[PDB]
Every structure is written in C-alpha cells, then in structure tokens.
Design a protein around this ligand. Structure first.
Ligand SMILES: CN1CCCN(Cc2ccc(-c3ccc(CN4CCCN(C)CC4)cc3C#N)cc2)CC1
Ligand SMILES: CN1CCCN(Cc2ccc(-c3ccc(CN4CCCN(C)CC4)cc3C#N)cc2)CC1
Lengths: 352, 351
C-alpha cells in the first residue's frame, strides 16, 4: 500500500527492467504492496494482474528493495554472484535507489525453530556450502576486529542527552571496553579458525522457510540478507549463530526483544550442528578415524564458543552505535547490556 | 617492468585477494610486468615464481587492471559474464581496479575479421552474448541517448590549435543536429530487436586463444564489455561491420588507416548473419529455405542502416576524445573518416 511517489517509480523500474508482460504494462494495472516500511531498507511486493498472461521467463511477481537512507559495488557484485550461483535470490534489476529481486514465497524462521534438529542440521549445511564459495573479495581476516575497533572508537566519542541512555552508556563504559577488546583479541589470536566467506549475520530473521518444502528434510531453507558478509573467521559465523538461539526480536513491547541465556545450545546440540557442517564443508571428513573425528569436533567447539565471544562484543558495540544514529523503535541500549551480560557470563563459563 | 609505486600495491592486492601460494608470497617473490601502460586501464601481468608450486587450483598468472584516470553496473556485469564463462574470471575486485584471469592470447588484426572462419565465430559469439539476461534497463535509450550526450559536448568543444579548429569547423558544417534527426527518422522506421549488445566489437576486443588457432569454431573470446548495454542488435552488427574498414595498428600518425573498400561484401555479410541467426534463435535452422532468405535480406537492410549510427556515434565520440584524451591518436582525422564513411554509406543505401 505504498505512497504515490514510490510505486510510480516502482512501476517505472519494473516496466523497464522486467521482460515479458511487464514491458507493456500500464500504470493502472500495476500491483504493489508493502512488506516492510521504515527509512533504510523498504521492501515491496510487485506483480502483474492475475488476469495478465506472462509471455515467457519473466516472473509474475518480484521484490522491490529501496536502499533508503562505494561499498555498494561489493554488495551489488556479491548479490549478483550468489544469484548466478543459485545460493541467493535471482537479480532482475539493479539501480542506484535499490534493486529488483526474485520474490520467494516463504516466511522467516522463529527463534525457537533454530533449535529443531532438522532445521539446525540444514542451517549447518547451508552455512558450510556458503563457506566454500570463492568471492572476489579481500581474503585477509581483518573484518572482525577492524569492525569492532571502528565501532569502539565511535562508541567512546558519543554522548547521549536523555538520562536513561546516559546511564546505561556509562555502565557499559565501566567495563573498560578498549582493554577488554584487547583481552579478547589476544584470546582469539591464539584460537585457530579457518578464514572463509562468512554470512556474519545468520539469525532467524535472515533464514527463509521455503514454501512447499516443509517436508523435505535437508532442503527447505535459504540464507538471505548478505549485507554483512565478508571473509572472516569461520568460528565467528557459527558462534554468532549459536548466540542468536538466545535472542527473540519478535517481542512486541520495549525493549522489543527477550534475552534467555538458558537457550544457548547445549553441548549435544552444538555437536548436532557441527556434525552436519563438517561433512558438508570438507570431503574426506566422513571417513576419518572415529577417533580423529572427535578431536576435530571437540576443538571446533572451543573455537566456535570462543568466537561467540566476538559476536557478543561486536553486536554489543554495534547496538550502542545504533542507539545514537538509528530512529527505529528498538531498545538498542538494553540490547547492548544484554550482549555484554552474555559476554561476561560466557567468559565465566569458559574459564577464559 | 613497472615503477616502484605500484609494484607494491600490486603485490598487496595479489597477496590479499588470491588464494594458494599467493597467501604466503614474499614481496621479493612477486613478479609483475607491464602489458599496457598509459593513463587509464593500465594492464599488468602478475605471476608466481616458476620455482613456486601452487597449493590448490589458484591461478599461476593473473591480469591486473587499474582504472587510473557506470561504476556499479560495470562491476556487476563483469562478475556476471565471468560467472557464465563468457568473460575472464574475476579474481578480485577493489575501488581502484580489479584482478582478472590472464588469458594466453593475442588480439585479432583488422584483416582477420574477414576470414570466413573468424567472422563465423564472431557472429556466433555475438549472438550468444545477445541472448543473455542482465539486470539492466531494457529500454533502448543508449544509442541516441549517447549520441545526444556527445553532440552537446561537441557543440561546446572549443579547440586551441588552429588545425583542430579548422577540422572541427569542417565537421560542424555538416549540421550534425539536423543530421542526427534524419538518422533517427531512419532508424525509427527500421525494426531491430533490443538485446544485450557488446557495442564495441572491434578486433582489439576479440582474443585469439593461444593453443587453438586450429579450432574451427572455438578459438575466440569477446572482451572489454565497457560499453555494453541493451541496444538495437542492428547496431552491434553494423558497428562490427564498420570495423572491417579501420586498422588501428598503423604506426605513423594519425595511427589508423581507413579503407572503404574493405567493408564486407553482400556475400561476406550473408556469411556472418548465416552464422548469427542459427546461434540467436535455434529454431531458425529449421525454417524454409525461402523463409530464411526473407529474414536474411531483412537483416541486411537492418544492419546496414544501423551501421550509420556506428559512424555517427563514434564520430562524435572521436571529436570529444580529441579534446580530452591523452592517448596519442589522430582522433579528429578518425572523426573525419567516420563521417565520410557516414555520408558515403547514406549514398550507397540511397537513404
Ligand atoms: C517497534 N516495533 C516492534 C516490533 C518489531 N518492529 C520492527 C523491528 C525492530 C527491530 C528489529 C531488530 C533489531 C535488532 C536486532 C539485532 N541484530 C542482531 C545482530 C546483527 N544483525 C546485524 C543486525 C540486528 C534484530 C532485529 C530483528 N529481526 C526488527 C524489527 C515493528 C514495530
Ligand atoms: C606507442 N603507440 C603510439 C601510437 C598509439 N598506440 C596505442 C593506440 C593505438 C590505437 C588506439 C585506438 C584509437 C581509436 C579507436 C577507435 N574506437 C572505435 C569505436 C569505439 N571503441 C569505443 C573505442 C575505439 C581504436 C583504437 C584501437 N585499438 C588507441 C591506442 C600504438 C603505439
């Protein structure tokens, strides 16, 4: 149900980028609905009249994405490659204000569904698959600390007015974040983790349950929303996803999420995850001595659980930045504290 | 060999974007030599020590392209053609250039365009290029949109040296603005399907892949897609036809030769489209002999009319380049040649 400005532009983009019955479509026969509002990444559904016949390949329906409010070449290139490789939505139109993507009938996963075994198992293969991909991007694992550093620096020089924000900020600064960041760096630099191509934001909202596939056991999911992807420590991608088991963002009152540290996957669950990931990420694995299979798994658990620490720290720092620059209704500061609570609680669990 | 102020940048770009041996490579193991210097799109050949064994399936040798002297589209496109195996693989992409697959090869010379085998494959490859879907605007704005952009530039160009002034004055005296409109009226009444066109299909942009000079139908690749867009197919073919007449390897100023006689004969043209059509609508082969001729005769009128836009567009392009480019080349004489070819071709076609 868009506003007159968009939808007219939406109409123009579709008629000009989409082949088939689109190219002759009149404005008056153009259907567009909202999927998400806001000011950053607005989403719309666009479609032909149901009375209108497609001529060929062209889709009956597409997703319009407006970038809203030159790393945008990397994002664009990346998205086009995953499309060609069928890992992502097909790409029908790229232009300065946004893109036109394949519409994929689906819903997103809920937080509690992440712990379902088949779900978890598939997510593990998908992420594996994702990791084996060559991408024309810088292969140096600089993203994780480069990004945390960047946020830290921002964080240190931001000043709130509103009282409750000024308080929450000082308590977080109590921890001495620069010292802690460095503590975390040395801890992780001593933690071997293969640099690969990482989703980096693999949470339930960015995983699709594909329609008509809810019976297929290993084949009903697609990972989307690749905006944070980059070559990174594998441990981060897996640990960050483990961390997401703990957070529910569908909560309808301020601060608009629930943290539950008891929901972090158990040892048995993590093993169930990486037991799908591992054979999906390398060849000979399936038939290594059952004795050495364990050694890798046990080491992989220390790895992901350590890097899950970076997930807490990164997104905690990120969250604080969002509290200053974002207008979206979300308790970013409360969510900041939550991630640092988990950070230190997770610390005490690992004896590190 | 290159200058020190780039041999490093290149080493870093390679160490950091390429897998395999490239990961641990020491600055004193890095080999890099120039392919084409210049001011923009400087080419380089970066390679591993012959004494270094590759760890995986990483490339031993890669091409580095510096942008030097659009933007998102050009990069998406290259990534895509690489993903489809129409273009060189894309090994690394960054703000001031990119790493591409190095293809052992040489460029076609002008005269090779007319070898029946070479011009058959080019037709086939252009046809294949033409069937590709790309995430770009499918409205055929590019042709006259660019000619207007250039014409406006030209009517604004002011030259310093008396000669360029004379020449620009001989060109302006054709009344480009009125001529453009005569052209539009002609092409508007000339049916031509819109497709993804290479738009610059000249010999310098067609590689002859070394080690298959003997292949009959698989010895070429089209490259340099830097002008590619959705456009009237007639232009891509017409433009390529025009390129039979110009040889850019001439070593004395103005550094090209134009040769009207070397424009493809009806027979040669039919030979080209006879390869193109099968490759562009697979059913075409099964048509009635008589019907094929209907369509061929029809495509001849099409491509030869649009060849006019090739002369016009690039003629205007060449005046602009005279003022701005630092590449040594008689742009203004090339412009004059293209407009001569433009008016001669109008007379030939009686249009
Ligand atoms: C005020 N509103 C209440 C309920 C939802 N809402 C909009 C709304 C608001 C906020 C979110 C949301 C906020 C933070 C996070 C945490 N991040 C996880 C770590 C990294 N990912 C970079 C980026 C987000 C997730 C979600 C997620 N998913 C999602 C939707 C509409 C009305
Ligand atoms: C050291 N050198 C001295 C003299 C120039 N030189 C380099 C050199 C030689 C020729 C060209 C050159 C100039 C114009 C054109 C015409 N254009 C055709 C229409 C559109 N295509 C956009 C782009 C080019 C082609 C070439 C082509 N190919 C450009 C650079 C050779 C040794």
């Amino acid at each position: 149900q868009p506003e007159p400005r968009t939808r007219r532009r939406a109409y123009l983009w579709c008629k000009e980028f989409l082949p088939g019955a689109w190219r002759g479509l009149r404005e008056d026969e153009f259907h567009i609905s909202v999927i998400r509002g806001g000011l950053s990444n607005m989403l719309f559904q666009c479609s032909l009249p149901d009375t209108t016949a497609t001529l060929g390949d062209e889709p009956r329906k597409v997703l319009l994405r407006l970038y809203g409010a030159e790393a945008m070449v990397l994002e664009s290139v990346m998205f086009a490659i995953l499309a060609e490789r069928s890992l992502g939505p097909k790409l029908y139109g790229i232009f300065p204000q946004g893109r036109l993507e394949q519409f994929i009938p689906s819903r997103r996963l809920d937080t509690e569904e992440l712990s379902l075994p088949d779900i978890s198992a598939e997510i593990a293969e998908k992420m594996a698959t994702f990791h084996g991909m060559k991408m024309p991007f810088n292969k140096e694992p600089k993203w994780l600390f480069g990004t945390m550093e960047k946020y830290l620096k921002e964080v240190l020089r931001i000043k709130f007015t509103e009282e409750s924000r000024i308080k929450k900020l000082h308590k977080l600064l109590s921890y001495n974040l620069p010292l802690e960041l460095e503590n975390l760096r040395s801890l992780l630099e001593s933690t071997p983790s293969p640099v690969v191509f990482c989703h980096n934001d693999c949470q339930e909202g960015n995983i699709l349950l594909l329609e008509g596939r809810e019976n297929s056991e290993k084949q009903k999911l697609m990972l989307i929303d690749f905006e944070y992807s980059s070559y990174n420590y594998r441990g981060f991608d897996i640990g960050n996803h483990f961390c997401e088991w703990m957070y529910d963002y569908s909560y309808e009152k301020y601060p608009f999420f629930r943290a539950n540290i008891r929901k972090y996957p158990t040892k048995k669950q993590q093993l169930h995850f990486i037991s799908s990931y591992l054979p999906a990420f390398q060849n000979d694995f399936e038939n290594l001595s059952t004795e050495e299979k364990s050694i890798i798994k046990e080491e992989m658990l220390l790895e992901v659980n350590r890097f899950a620490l970076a997930s807490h720290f990164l997104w905690g720092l990120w969250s604080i930045v969002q509290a200053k620059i974002s207008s979206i209704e979300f308790g970013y500061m409360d969510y900041a504290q939550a991630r640092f609570d988990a950070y230190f609680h997770q610390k005490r669990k690992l004896g590190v």
